[PDB]
């Protein structure tokens, strides 16, 4: 093409980019355990078999736990606001454990919380504080 010949003749120079080799090489970037054990010399399927993992869940087309223990071991590696705490304390003082009476408190139960929610919050407060 005309533009290609002009660029070749121009003294600006080509913006050379060499990345063919980088297409073959891909570094694992989603797990630290695999990276230490992964071997780039082998293929994806071979690497998965070496690690002890499945690279395909469906019957693959065409013909065909020393590391998983680390993954399993890797598996073994909220409170109440101050205003919420004060509101809970007020109701607890005014009604104690009388959940039914606490429900009908018009001027302390500003939000009509259910008996279950009130008792759960009070139990959480008691466990956290007493």
């Amino acid at each position: 093409s005309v533009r290609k010949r002009k660029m070749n003749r121009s003294s600006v120079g080509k913006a050379t980019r060499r990345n063919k080799d980088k297409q073959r090489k891909i570094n694992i970037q989603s797990n630290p355990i695999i990276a230490a054990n992964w071997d780039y010399s082998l293929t994806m399927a071979q690497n998965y078999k070496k690690l002890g993992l499945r690279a395909k869940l469906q019957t693959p087309a065409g013909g065909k736990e020393t590391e998983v223990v680390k993954k399993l071991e890797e598996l073994a590696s909220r409170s109440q606001s101050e205003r919420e705490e004060e509101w809970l304390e007020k109701l607890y003082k005014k009604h104690g454990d009388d959940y039914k009476k606490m429900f009908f408190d018009k001027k302390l139960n500003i939000y009509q919380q259910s008996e279950g929610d009130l008792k759960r919050r009070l139990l959480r407060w008691k466990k956290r504080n007493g």
Partner: protein
């Protein structure tokens, strides 16, 4: 007139793309678990084949939800109904095996 000189090139590109996906998706197997399917067209009904995704009923019977199942690598298809007990049982067993074989890392 198109000649598939790139056949080898296309295969190499597909392999490189799969390797890149594995590098990004190293922990996972690159595939979503698919259910067993019986085909229509009696000429092929004898053949059992993989489907798109498990039905909502199968996912419920497997002890997990579709929203949670998708995040674990289970294909969910809400369009397919269920009219065969054997296929439903096979899909449930496959899902149970998948759940018993999968390992999930903590989010912490």
């Amino acid at each position: 007139v198109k000649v598939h000189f790139d056949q080898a090139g296309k295969k190499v590109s597909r392999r490189n793309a799969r390797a890149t996906r594995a590098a990004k998706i190293a922990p996972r197997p690159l595939d979503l678990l698919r259910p067993v399917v019986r085909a229509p067209t009696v000429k092929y009904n004898r053949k059992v084949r993989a489907g798109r995704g498990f039905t909502l009923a199968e996912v419920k019977a497997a002890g997990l939800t579709a929203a949670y199942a998708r995040t674990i690598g289970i294909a969910v298809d809400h369009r397919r109904q269920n009219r065969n007990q054997e296929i439903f049982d096979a899909n449930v067993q496959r899902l149970k095996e998948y759940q018993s074989k999968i390992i999930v890392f903590p989010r912490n």
